[PDB]
Amino acid sequence: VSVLTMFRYAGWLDRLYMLVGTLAAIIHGVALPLMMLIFGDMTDSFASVGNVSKNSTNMSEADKRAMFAKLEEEMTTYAYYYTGIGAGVLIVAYIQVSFWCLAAGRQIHKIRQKFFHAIMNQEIGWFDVHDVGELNTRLTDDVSKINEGIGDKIGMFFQAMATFFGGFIIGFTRGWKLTLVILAISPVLGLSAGIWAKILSSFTDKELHAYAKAGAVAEEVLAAIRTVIAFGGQKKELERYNNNLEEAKRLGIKKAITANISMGAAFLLIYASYALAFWYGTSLVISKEYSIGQVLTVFFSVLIGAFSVGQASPNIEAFANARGAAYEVFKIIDNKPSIDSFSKSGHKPDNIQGNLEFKNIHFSYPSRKEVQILKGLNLKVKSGQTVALVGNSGCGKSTTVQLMQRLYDPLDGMVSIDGQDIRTINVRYLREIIGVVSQEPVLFATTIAENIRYGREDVTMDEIEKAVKEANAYDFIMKLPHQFDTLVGERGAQLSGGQKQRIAIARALVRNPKILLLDEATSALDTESEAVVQAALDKAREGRTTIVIAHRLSTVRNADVIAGFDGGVIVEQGNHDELMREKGIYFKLVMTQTLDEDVPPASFWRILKLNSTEWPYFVVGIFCAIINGGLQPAFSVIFSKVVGVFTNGGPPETQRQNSNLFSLLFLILGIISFITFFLQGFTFGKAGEILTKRLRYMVFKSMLRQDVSWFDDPKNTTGALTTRLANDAAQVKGATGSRLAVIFQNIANLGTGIIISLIYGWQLTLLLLAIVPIIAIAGVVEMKMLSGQALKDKKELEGSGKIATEAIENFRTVVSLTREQKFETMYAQSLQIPYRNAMKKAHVFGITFSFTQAMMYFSYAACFRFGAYLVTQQLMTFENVLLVFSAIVFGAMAVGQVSSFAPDYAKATVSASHIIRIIEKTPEIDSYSTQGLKPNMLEGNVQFSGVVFNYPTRPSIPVLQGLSLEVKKGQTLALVGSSGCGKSTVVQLLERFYDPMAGSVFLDGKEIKQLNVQWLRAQLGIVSQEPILFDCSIAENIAYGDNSRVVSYEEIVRAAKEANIHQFIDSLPDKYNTRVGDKGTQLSGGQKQRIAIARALVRQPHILLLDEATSALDTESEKVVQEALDKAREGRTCIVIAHRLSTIQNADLIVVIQNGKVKEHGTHQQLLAQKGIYFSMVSVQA
């Protein structure tokens, strides 16, 4: 039910098609065992011919005839065999695939529309809860997973019937009890295999979780980069915990990694066992009873039943994860909670006009426990009026405004619009009859003409023309290029909020309600706009009764009636004057305000050379690799022998030949493997260990030393970096392992394959090499075609998913609701295309997979038939075919390698390139000389000649053009610009974070941008806006280890003293030991600054860089800061930049710089004597 059924709901000819295919799949897997039985019949007639060929020394003619007759006889059996099994595979395959598609296809599609629309119907709730971020996320993600659920499933039913039926069919029909001995030994061995292997595979899981832990403890904080450069360099810590947990869980999970190699070894060991019991049980039940040297069929075949149950396993899984998540989020899908709104039929009020009535409504927010914001609200408002609400403590006003669109249904009491109860009239009809405008003027990524249109589908640019003209916007739109058909550059980020809101005005305007609501629309907008806007707001009001909650008492004056609120506490009501007269709430309050990347340059073999560098040595590794390969073709050889010696050889010692080879297999495979692996696992594994660890150490430091425009102007977040750390150390690891695997399979396949290939027979060697590289190329192109369709599909669906998102993310839409479907409709359109396209590609996968399989039987037809070729009187085509097919097996072993081990080397290398390009870098300012700190450099006079610069993005026109400043010693250089840039950049330039484009600086005499970077940052009293202190203790923080500076106790005492933070240091549990406490979230910015300053003075600068230090503080914080800073200055030079046009007075040389160029300068009153820039600044101040 629910889970699975719903999960597969909705398909007539679909469900039928689904079944159909299913069947196909069945006949398919089964098709493979049949294939095995056959190899039986052919291998048996073949064995007969070889045994009589063994007797020989007699009737030469009777032999020409018996062997030719049997040759052509089976040569035919082969024709009709591959013809059979073959044609089959092809056909049904293509079919099962169509299941996959068609099925999931239309399925998903359906689920698609029903989900979009679903969300667009869950209403309020999608604002109520959800992450409405995480939602569209799961939108796309989940939908897809459901799909993969439908297709892989098909594949599952498949291999499920391949194992079940095959292992049955053969595992019971051929043997009678022999097939049963098979069942005995084979299944039992399959058990022990899957068991032990899986037990230690999960032991690997546990080891990997122990890793992730070691990982984060190998992560730490790596942001706060800037403050860090102005600090020095962590470098030990990182490395410490780094390699620490690394090496530990390294050897450890590498013990389970090597144990994983102990697993590939346990499985292979047991493999050998498979052989052991296999051949043994055979040799016996093939020498005594059931003498057919064809037990091979049954036994081998059931093996196939096992491996098919495996593949079956991952497929099922996908059906699960798909089933599970799909149906659960499906429940959050098809489900139609709604009912607190909905969108259909309802009550129709043609009466047009009416009065708003709020009759005792008790409302609690959707957050259950949240205290009812409308602890009983009574408020009626006549038509034609314009009532405003006033509050301040948040949540109540906007709340009423809110439920006026029926948004949240009232918890109790009710509200009657016009004279009928809001809850009784149709919702759409309501929402349309209710024009509203909140603060956020949301605009869609389209043209103005549109946004408007959105407000109302049908409408001619004519009406829009007037509408806007009325919403007074017909001007900027005009002066705006493209006219009405002007887009809004990806979202509502291309014009002033004033304009935006305005447009909206227009929007809702064209809606022309009867009830207009303004949720502090004007709010959050410059004064000027504020006026023009209010203006429009008015022009649209008064013909429409309107309620308005705002803070601009100024725009509250023209109120036909004011509403007393301040967080959900109704009170005084009536005209402005009446409330002022009431000297209550109004009066008072009125008087209270008066992650993408991808880089072209890769790195061919470069990673392999730098590979070796990051490697001491491990021939031992490559060695065991090689021998390992040799080990594989070996089994190949030996097997051929076994089957051969027994299918055509001498009757005596048949048991010694059998007991020998089978025993051999065992010792050979099992022992050399478990050993070859373990051994390598240890070597190559340790390889990845150091490589990673060491790699990190370098990469990280490379960053530490790195810096300038890097973190100064980065687009490489702290995460992206940290990640880079982990992932890439790991990926290169995969680079060395691959290289290992490469040499391996190679010599394995290539080498041994060719050797045995020379002892071939020249018919087989060639026909087969044609077959392996060919089916190989068909597999690679198979994948390629598959990723392609997958990629392009993700792009069309993307577009569709981007818009859809835009709507759900921007629920505001609902405000007009005049688009829901309209929207989804447009998406139906896009969806429409990738749906027909999903069909085409469907068929595709079909023909592809099929053609694959084709190549399969085909290859077998050629192989066996071409092998057996001419065998009249005994020709060079006998048992050797085994070895030949061993070469086919060899190609298939190489496939086992590229489908296993370290990643496809691809992402491995790309990630390798990244870590390289980074570990490399260009230091730019590490150690050096470039000064000697002569006992007479302790001045501090800063010089700025030319000063032209502009952090990386030069075509944005430099923010430093021909600048020039200067500053004496032991004084305070005042600095004030226009805003943001200029101030900080200079400070920066001093810190030499960015070497100016043209010009230079002089901290005292020598040339800054030549002086010693290290020392120039040794003396520096830096304290910018947003401070910061690592999750250390204040004592340590205060004692900021700039360099060899040993945490000087009495020194730091000096820091808390002057800094003015000794207050928190006095008492407050632990005194100096208190860790910032949870990364710092326990001390006010004032405090943190106090420690900031402590830092500076702790370094005893000769220059103090104050970057608006206190610029988001308050009482005694700004005061105590300016005082500590007061004694913190004057003994040593200090450029103090700031936007405190008030406390800047106390300055020696105040410099008024107009971004790029300084315009005025000198002493305060003097600048005031210069009525102009500085003047207009203190006057705007007031």
Ligand SMILES: CC(C)[C@H]1NC(=O)c2c[se]c(n2)[C@@H](C(C)C)NC(=O)c2c[se]c(n2)[C@@H](C(C)C)NC(=O)c2c[se]c1n2
């Ligand atoms: C592929 C199916 C037709 C069929 N095999 C043959 O017809 C065949 C004819 Se000679 C022979 N197998 C012997 C012999 C060469 C030693 N094979 C191996 O020692 C060997 C070692 Se790993 C490996 N195979 C992988 C690889 C090949 C995928 N194959 C299978 O798990 C598998 C399961 Se059923 C099956 N194969």
